[PDB]
Design a binder for this molecule. Structure first.
Ligand code: CLA
Ligand code: CLA
Ligand code: CLA
Ligand code: CLA
Ligand code: CLA
Ligand code: CLA
Ligand code: CLA
Ligand code: CLA
Ligand SMILES: CCCCCCCCCCCCCCCC(=O)OC[C@H](COP(=O)(O)OC[C@@H](O)CO)OC(=O)CCCCCCCCCCCCCCC
Ligand SMILES: CC1=C(/C=C/C(C)=C/C=C/C(C)=C/C=C/C=C(C)/C=C/C=C(C)/C=C/C2=C(C)CCCC2(C)C)C(C)(C)CCC1
Ligand code: SF4
Ligand code: SF4
Lengths: 143, 107, 732, 165, 64, 80, 41, 41
């Protein structure tokens, strides 16, 4: 967005009971994901890996094992309560990565500030045959 | 104990006359397996006339049930609160349906 | 980062259990290996071919060693019709006391296994008599296996690694292989036959000590340098001749009597001697055809570019095809596998009708096992041929290289070929199942005369054209006035006619309407397998559902649930579905062979003739009547020698069922189940200390198809082999 | 007497099968009174069996070593010998109806594709036009031949969806 | 202006398209100079279920 | 991880980025379409290959293509 | 022996060789393969 | 009748009318005539 926000460990967490679906040993040895949203009141939402939880009035913090869980929760919140949340990625060494709103305007918009990446100006099906790129290490679509 | 039950008779059209097996009693047909003869011996049934009457009554009740479905949907459809009366449904299908049927069969 | 997939750096980065399976599966896919050129790929294939040669020679050396050690080859030589062959002794510590007692067959002491591989008849025919000679053969074959090992290592070092252009030398390779690998090899084989097997069948022992002192023919090479080659075909073996002694024998090394030996029920030794000599001469002559360093010869590219028919019959003809075949290794592999599978089918169809080994026809179970083995091998090899042709079409096919040629034109109207194959397969299946169901429900109603019995007039007419006088068609080779009968009337006609008019042997058996119906079922299976393999090959690189299939590799799972659903869209899955049809087709041909031959051996050919028409008779008199001795291998009353075959039967059933386990259910439910197991292991006392290094991950969809097909095929093969050998060994 | 097959009239196994069928059919006759409906049905079955065995004989039918009649498939061999009635004429008899079905389906397909939103005509059939084509398909081979000749039977590939290989 | 007439039937020669060698009806042609300005509508859906697609000027011709 | 490529046939319906529950795709400004948008895949290494973008793609053939191969701990959808 | 020089193995060789390749050689195979797979660079 | 005959021209005109007609036709050929094998008129 205008300024990249850093997650705060002091934000509270939604009220939830013990669910067997949640963080595993991968949250320790490898990276894990943290989702943050601001709520105006106490509402009931369904966790992407568990049952139902009551979010707090204000900031919220949810730790999820995969980025797909974080984006499923984000889409659920945006569809239900138009929450517009954001999620992070916390590595095993403590590195915090910003993933979802890189431009702060979501991938649906453009913002005129991001470059094209992995884009082919040729048409699909105009790719060369695999014989033309044999023993080269480059796929026809990677050209 | 000596005559095998039979309630389906095939046509002599093409080779099916071998399927009309000699089940005994001067009768040929498919040896049935649903046990309907045992049921019609449990409930007191002697002649085929009573079976005919039961069949006609069943056809009449089937026509009544189809007319009931047509009426209760197209003509006079119950509301949602009528279906949501769970206590009345349970009472009427416990005392009424199951209990009344058990009493009628006992009688 | 691991190092087990050294050929694939990307596979080594996989932290799951999929890395192990994919590294094992992509072990010899050198074209997809990381950082590998064409020349090193060709050298690796050369070394791999040397390795397979060494493995083959080691395996046959072990067969010789085990037969010479624990077999009854001397006792089989003394009495072939009575003594059974022995493969290897059985040392199983889990065996019980009755189990040891029930496997001492063939007049042996310990538990032994009866050999149905046919090596006893083959080695008795080629002059091997004692186990000493089999031991010497075993050690020599081990020596040449070690030689091939060292040669495979030899062509991997610098100053010894052949160049890329050396492999692409087509004309000299074909010249040398056709001249020496076929021609002079067959010449050496017929020389061995004449020197050793011809005298050893006539009571004259020829060995290394005395083959330079004995003479193969009493004239002694004077016919060869002169023109009088008929002196070799002067005194052939008479009808009353024994294969072990010289009772009523003659001095002939090359003869063309034809037919079978009256005692051994096998082809004459002089017949195959002249056969291999003529094949040797013709192949050495044909090996001097292609162009080499000398000025004479033929160029393959010139022949391919020259054979373009006028008026645009094949467009560009075979123009630009030499580089297509030479550059693409998969094209050559598919052609080689196609020819090898077709000739394995030919070998299977010609071994049983024309047995070349003495007392092979008497051994019924051995002939059945040999036919079934080589037919299933041929079917698998043809499936591999079509699969590797599909791999050629997607991987290394260049349309601009050969524009308008036969290949591009075939790819242009691929829809017509696929549709016509679908039409002929659908028509064959529709009417074959219709007549089978018609006859079967007609036989059910107690009136078997109403079944449609279309007499096989075409094949009976062909058989009468070959000299079978049973059908009464007085065509050529059956009438004395025909020129074909007169030509060769004194050469091989009295032998061939006597062998083909005798119904006891397997040469051109009498065929009825049930034979014709099961032949049409065989044609249906071949047509459907061809249809699916051809459709997978032609749609390997492009389709209307997915035009960019060539960019996704040969073996990819799917494209997703979009566009209606794209499951099993690759040519790999086309091969995978075609293996089922191949297994069903070879099962049909082996069912037909086994039942017809079993009814011939038991003597009730009329039972097969009147029972093969309808499928219920097929089931009752083949899969039920012949399975009585098989399932009685281990009764609660007791156990017999067929206990191993019943256990193998149920084993094949269980492996086929596990194939169903992998085939019906698909990956995605197993991933969640494995996730629940992961949570169970991670959150338990006394077991969270032990942790996996490779993450447990369910089998991939391509991997799932492979393992389901694999389990299905091995279970199929094992249960049918067990039933076949138990039904053929229980009675005879 | 072709392919080593005896005629059905002069076959011993054919008569053996006939008398075996008569014996097993008369076995069930002893368990019913002669004036009974199962007896009448069994008598009708026996009469049909005898009529079938009589009509299959002396009808240019052969059987060999099994008592079950055999069919001769090669034309010409079915012409010089009286065996065309086995498969020769019924081949054209089936092919006439098969071409009838294909031709009326093709006529309905063309006459439906020239109508607005033509995808509903396949699920909502029209009966008068389909019956009109159903009673106009007797001369299907002449119509097919003339359509092949004028080129309206086939269509230019240029207008045919082709796989992009 | 630079493409075919709106409402006129055109033939698609794009090989990877589902409607290769098929006839579609032009609904709009873009005049802003984009990669595939010709917009056509087909009476038969594809496997994805859509009925409209965009093609370049060289991928459309008048059917005979 | 997997390879996700977007071709010039895209017309900027910005629905392929909604169907992807991993934030692999993004919309960048363009000039080759009427909508002046083009799909781009900066976080390609986070893709699993679920082909939901290909399902959501209305162009024939697909403007966004996903190619399987080289699975990782994030491309396999593993929470363990 | 009468040309047993293509050495005939003893009649007790199965008792040593069958468990050698049924129990020991598979054990070496599993150990060697498991050391191969779990090898980090 | 218009609404009813529009429904009656759907699936049962081809799935039932053709099926019943062709079936019962073939039943009556197989009934009045006995089982044939050779087309001898
Ligand atoms: C008497 C005149 C005559 C005749 C009859 C032929 C006949 C032939 N010539 Mg020709 N030729 C002639 C004079 C003649 N030649 C002369 C004077 C010259 C100049 C010297 C040549 C030079 C010449 C060349 C250079 C070549 C031929 C070839 C051929 C063969 C193929 C022709 C063709 O276009 O394929 C037929 C047309 C097609 C379109 C092929 C269609 C095939 C279909 C699609 C396959 C159907 C498969 C089907 C399913 C199989 C079912 C079987 C079942 C068991 C399953 C054919 C046998 C070619 C050859 O050798 O091939 C054998 C070739 O390369 N000719
Ligand atoms: C024994 C079981 C069996 C049977 C009977 C079939 C039958 C068929 N499969 Mg096969 N298939 C099987 C198992 C079987 N499959 C298995 C286990 C696999 C591995 C996955 C495959 C894989 C496979 C592939 C990959 C292909 C086939 C194809 C075919 C067709 C081949 C065409 C043919 O022979 O004429 C038709 C054969 C018949 C037996 C006709 C069956 C229909 C009869 C007449 C009944 C019709 C209905 C009847 C009138 C009753 C109506 C009422 C009823 C519908 C309720 C045919 C429909 C090919 C195909 O469809 O392309 C042409 C094809 O490409 N199959
Ligand atoms: C490769 C082919 C092959 C096969 C499948 C068999 C199979 C058998 N042999 Mg035999 N064997 C073979 C070749 C073979 N043999 C050769 C060439 C020799 C002579 C050196 C022997 C010497 C031999 C003896 C002395 C004994 C057996 C025994 C056995 C049985 C138990 C398995 C066992 O202990 O392995 C055999 C184990 C060995 C160590 C001997 C084989 C030595 C190999 C061939 C050399 C290594 C080559 C290569 C590097 C590795 C081969 C693997 C390759 C196939 C992939 C079994 C029936 C035992 C038995 O009960 O008899 C029935 C027994 O006592 N074998
Ligand atoms: C004592 C009263 C009574 C009786 C006997 C029944 C009997 C039945 N009800 Mg119930 N029901 C009742 C009161 C009653 N209902 C009340 C008060 C309510 C509202 C709260 C409902 C709401 C209700 C629902 C929502 C459904 C049923 C259904 C059913 C049938 C269950 C199928 C079965 O078990 O097979 C037994 C089958 C038979 C014995 C066959 C004979 C059926 C006869 C003709 C029915 C006669 C009973 C009827 C109450 C008589 C008065 C109706 C009058 C206006 C003519 C059964 C016939 C199911 C249904 O639709 O089936 C009709 C269903 O889904 N009931
Ligand atoms: C001599 C002939 C020949 C040659 C040179 C090749 C060579 C090749 N083929 Mg081909 N192929 C052949 C025969 C041949 N194959 C046959 C006969 C078939 C039909 C079965 C196939 C089917 C086939 C397919 C479908 C594919 C190949 C592929 C390949 C490549 C790598 C395969 C490999 O080594 O993976 C090593 C594989 C393994 C180590 C797995 C072994 C598991 C086997 C196959 C299952 C056996 C069942 C069971 C477990 C056996 C044990 C039973 C138990 C009771 C003991 C390589 C170019 C692949 C390719 O090109 O990649 C794109 C590919 O997709 N081939
Ligand atoms: C599918 C191929 C096929 C096969 C294998 C046969 C096989 C046969 N036919 Mg037939 N035929 C066929 C199709 C076939 N027919 C067709 C489609 C027709 C057109 C209706 C004919 C018309 C026909 C006639 C008119 C005659 C045969 C005859 C014969 C027999 C001898 C033919 C001969 O010696 O050739 C000789 C070839 C020399 C070049 C033989 C049983 C003859 C017969 O009855 O034999 C006694 C005979 O007179 N055939
Ligand atoms: C009357 C319409 C019609 C016509 C003229 C054709 C014509 C053709 N089809 Mg097709 N087919 C049709 C309907 C039709 N089909 C239907 C409805 C299906 C779905 C079951 C198929 C499924 C199908 C397959 C799977 C295959 C063919 C093939 C073929 C070719 C071989 C000829 C043949 O008998 O195939 C056999 C045809 C069938 C087994 C389908 C029988 C279904 C019935 C008879 C059609 C009912 C249509 C109905 C009567 C028309 C309405 C009449 C109107 C008055 C209302 C030929 C081009 C084959 C091919 O490509 O060869 C080149 C091929 O492999 N067809
Ligand atoms: C579609 C096939 C088909 C055909 C061709 C016929 C034709 C016939 N039926 Mg039949 N019928 C059919 C279907 C068919 N039916 C069905 C589906 C049933 C079951 C409902 C019956 C039940 C039936 C009975 C119960 C009787 C007939 C009778 C008759 C015959 C007298 C009617 C007449 O004069 O028509 C014109 C005929 C011109 C040849 C006639 C040959 C009667 C009979 O036996 O003939 C005296 C008779 O008693 N049919
Ligand atoms: C007639 C049976 C009842 C049909 C009812 C439905 C009629 C269509 C309903 C319909 O739409 O009718 C409208 C229209 C009326 O026909 P026309 O007034 O031109 O008169 C011609 C015939 O209908 C006379 O029957 O019918 C036709 O054009 C189809 C005629 C088919 C041919 C019928 C007569 C010829 C039959 C020949 C039979 C033997 C042929 C042998 C060689 C194949
Ligand atoms: C996919 C593909 C492929 C493959 C293919 C295949 C796999 C095929 C096969 C094929 C086959 C598998 C074929 C076969 C053939 C055969 C034949 C062609 C035969 C012939 C014969 C004859 C001609 C004979 C004659 C005779 C004689 C000599 C004697 C007796 C009499 C008579 C006359 C019969 C490839 C690689 C190319 C590549 C591309 C693609
Ligand atoms: S789904 Fe396809 S056409 Fe639509 S905006 Fe994305 S890449 Fe472009
Ligand atoms: S395959 Fe799935 S995760 Fe990957 S870019 Fe497409 S929609 Fe997103």
């Amino acid at each position: 967005p205008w300024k990249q926000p850093e997650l705060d460990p002091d934000t509270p967490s939604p009220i939830f009971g013990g669910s067997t679906g949640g963080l595993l040993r991968k949250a320790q040895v490898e990276e894990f994901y943290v989702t943050t949203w601001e709520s105006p009141k106490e509402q009931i939402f369904e966790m992407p890996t568990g049952g139902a939880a009551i979010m707090r009035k204000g900031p919220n913090l949810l730790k999820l094992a995969r980025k797909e869980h974080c984006l499923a929760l984000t889409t659920q919140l945006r569809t239900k309560f138009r929450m517009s949340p954001c999620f992070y990625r916390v590595y095993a060494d403590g590195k915090v990565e910003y993933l979802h709103p890189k431009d702060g305007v979501y991938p649906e918009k453009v913002n005129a500030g991001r470059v094209g990446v992995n884009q082919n100006m040729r048409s699909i099906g105009k790719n060369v045959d695999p014989i033309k790129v044999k023993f080269t290490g480059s796929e026809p679509f990677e050209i | 104990t000596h005559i095998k039950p039979s309630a389906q008779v095939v046509w002599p059209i093409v080779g099916q006359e071998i399927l009309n097996g000699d089940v005994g009693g001067g009768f040929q047909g498919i040896q049935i397996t649903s046990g309907f003869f045992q049921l019609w011996r449990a409930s007191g049934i002697t002649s085929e006339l009573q079976l005919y009457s039961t069949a006609i009554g069943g056809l009449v009740l089937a026509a009544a049930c189809f007319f009931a479905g047509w009426f209760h949907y197209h003509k006079a459809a119950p509301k949602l609160e009528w279906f949501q009366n769970v206590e009345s449904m349970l009472n009427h299908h416990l005392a009424g349906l199951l209990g009344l049927g058990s009493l009628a069969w006992a009688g | 980062t691991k190092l087990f997939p050294k050929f694939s750096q990307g596979l080594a980065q996989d932290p799951s259990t999929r890395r192990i399976w994919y590294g094992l599966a992509t072990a010899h896919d050198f074209e997809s290996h990381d950082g590998m050129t064409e020349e090193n790929l060709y050298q690796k294939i050369f070394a791999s071919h040397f390795g397979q040669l060494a493995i083959i020679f080691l395996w046959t050396s072990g067969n010789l060693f085990h037969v010479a050690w624990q077999g009854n080859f001397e006792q089989w030589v003394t009495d072939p019709i009575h003594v059974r062959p022995i493969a290897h002794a059985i040392w199983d510590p889990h065996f019980g006391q009755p189990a040891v007692e029930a496997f001492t067959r063939g007049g042996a002491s310990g538990p032994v296994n009866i050999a149905t591989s046919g090596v006893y008849q083959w080695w008795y025919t080629i002059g091997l008599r004692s186990n000493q000679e089999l031991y010497v053969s075993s050690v020599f074959l081990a020596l040449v296996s070690a030689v091939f090992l060292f040669a495979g290592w030899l062509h991997l070092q610098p100053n010894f690694q052949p160049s890329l252009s050396w492999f692409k030398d087509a004309e000299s390779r074909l010249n040398h292989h056709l001249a020496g690998l076929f021609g002079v090899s067959s010449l050496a084989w017929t020389g061995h036959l004449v020197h050793v097997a011809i005298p050893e069948s006539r009571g004259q022992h020829v060995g290394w000590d005395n083959f330079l002192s004995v003479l193969p023919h009493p004239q002694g090479l004077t016919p060869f340098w002169s023109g009088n080659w008929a002196a070799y075909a002067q005194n052939p073996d008479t009808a009353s001749h024994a294969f072990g002694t010289a009772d009523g024998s003659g001095t002939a090394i090359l003869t063309f009597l034809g037919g079978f030996h009256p005692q051994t029920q096998s082809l004459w030794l002089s017949d195959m001697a002249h056969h291999h000599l003529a094949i040797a001469v013709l192949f050495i002559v044909a090996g001097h055809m292609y162009r080499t360093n000398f000025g004479i010869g033929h160029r393959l590219e010139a022949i391919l570019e020259a054979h373009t028919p006028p008026a645009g019959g094949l467009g560009a003809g075979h123009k630009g095809l030499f580089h297509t075949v030479n550059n693409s290794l998969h094209f050559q592999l598919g052609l080689a596998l196609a020819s090898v599978g077709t000739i394995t089918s030919l070998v299977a169809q010609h071994m049983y009708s024309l047995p070349p080994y003495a007392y092979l026809a008497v051994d019924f179970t051995t002939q059945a096992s040999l036919y079934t083995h080589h037919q299933y091998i041929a079917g698998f090899i043809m499936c591999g041929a079509f699969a590797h042709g599909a791999i050629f079409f997607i991987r290394d096919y260049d349309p601009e290289q050969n524009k308008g040629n036969v290949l591009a034109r075939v790819l242009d109207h691929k829809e017509a070929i696929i549709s016509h194959l679908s039409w002929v397969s659908l028509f064959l299946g529709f009417h074959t199942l219709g007549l089978y169901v018609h006859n079967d429900v007609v036989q059910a109603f107690g009136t078997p005369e109403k079944q449609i019995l279309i007499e096989p007039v075409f094949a009976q007419w062909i058989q009468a054209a070959q000299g079978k006088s049973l059908y009464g068609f007085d065509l050529l080779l059956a009438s004395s006035s025909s020129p074909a009968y007169s030509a060769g009337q004194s050469l091989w006609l009295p032998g061939w006619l006597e062998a083909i008019n005798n119904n006891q042997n397997s040469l051109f058996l009498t065929i009825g309407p049930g034979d014709f119906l099961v032949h049409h079922a065989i044609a249906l299976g071949l047509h459907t397998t061809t249809l699916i393999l051809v459709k997978g090959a032609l749609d390997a690189r492009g389709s209307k559902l997915m035009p960019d299939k060539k960019d996704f590799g040969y073996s990819f799972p799917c494209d997703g649930p979009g566009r209606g659903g794209t499951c099993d869209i690759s040519a790999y899955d086309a091969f995978y579905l075609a293996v089922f049809w191949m297994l069903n087709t070879i099962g049909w041909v082996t069912f037909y062979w086994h039942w017809k031959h079993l009814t011939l051996w038991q003597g009730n050919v009329s039972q097969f003739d009147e029972s093969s028409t309808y499928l219920m008779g097929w089931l009752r008199d083949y899969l039920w009547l012949n399975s009585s001795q098989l399932i009685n291998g281990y009764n609660p009353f007791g156990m017999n020698s067929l206990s191993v075959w019943a256990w193998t039967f149920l084993f094949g059933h269980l492996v086929y069922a596990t194939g169903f386990m992998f085939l019906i259910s698909w990956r995605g439910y197993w991933q969640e189940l494995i996730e629940t197991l992961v949570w169970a292991h991670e959150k338990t006392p006394l077991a969270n200390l032990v942790y996996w290094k490779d993450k447990p991950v369910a089998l991939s969809i391509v991997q799932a198809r492979l393992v389901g097909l694999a389990h299905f095929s091995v279970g199929y093969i094992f249960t049918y082999a067990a039933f076949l050998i138990a039904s053929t060994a229980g009675r005879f | 007497d072709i392919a080593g097959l005896t005629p059905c009239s002069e076959s011993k196994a054919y008569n053996k099968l006939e008398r075996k069928e008569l014996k097993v059919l008369d076995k069930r006759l002893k368990k019913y009174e002669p004036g009974s409906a199962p007896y009448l049905a069994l008598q009708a079955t026996k009469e049909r069996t005898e009529n079938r065995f009589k009509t299959y004989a002396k009808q240019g039918l052969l059987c060999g070593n099994d008592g079950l009649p055999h069919l001769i498939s090669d034309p010409g061999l079915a012409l010089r010998f009286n065996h065309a009635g086995e498969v020769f004429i019924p081949t054209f008899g089936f092919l006439y109806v098969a071409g009838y079905i294909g031709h009326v389906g093709r006529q309905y397909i063309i006459l439906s594709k020239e109508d607005a939103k033509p995808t509903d005509k396949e699920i909502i059939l029209d009966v008068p036009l389909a019956l009109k084509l159903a009673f106009q398909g007797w001369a299907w081979p002449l119509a097919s031949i003339q359509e092949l000749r004028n080129g309206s039977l086939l269509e230019k590939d240029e207008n045919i969806t082709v796989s992009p290989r | 202006e630079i493409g075919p007439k709106r409402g006129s039937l055109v033939k698609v020669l794009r090989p990877e398209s589902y409607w290769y060698n098929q006839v579609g009806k032009v609904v709009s042609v873009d005049q802003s100079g984009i990669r595939y300005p010709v917009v056509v509508r087909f009476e038969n859906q594809n496997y994805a279920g859509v009925s409209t697609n965009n093609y370049a000027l060289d991928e459309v011709t008048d059917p005979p | 991880a997997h390879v996700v490529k977007i071709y010039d046939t895209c017309i900027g319906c910005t629905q392929c980025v909604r169907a992807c529950p991993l934030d692999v795709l993004e919309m960048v400004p363009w000039d080759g379409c009427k909508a002046a948008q083009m799909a781009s895949s900066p976080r390609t290494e986070d893709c699993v290959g679920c082909k939901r973008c290909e399902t959501a793609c209305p162009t024939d053939f697909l403007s966004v293509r996903v190619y399987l191969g080289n699975e990782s701990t994030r491309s396999l959808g593993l929470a363990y | 022996a009468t040309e047993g020089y293509p050495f005939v193995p003893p009649d007790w060789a199965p008792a040593l060789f069958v468990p050698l390749t049924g129990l020991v050689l598979p054990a070496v195979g599993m150990a060697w393969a498991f050391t191969y797979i779990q090898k980090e660079r | 009748m218009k609404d009813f005959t529009t429904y009656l021209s759907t699936a049962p005109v081809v799935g039932l009318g053709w099926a019943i007609f062709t079936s019962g036709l073939l039943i009556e050929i197989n009934r009045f005539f006995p089982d044939p094998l050779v087309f001898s008129f």
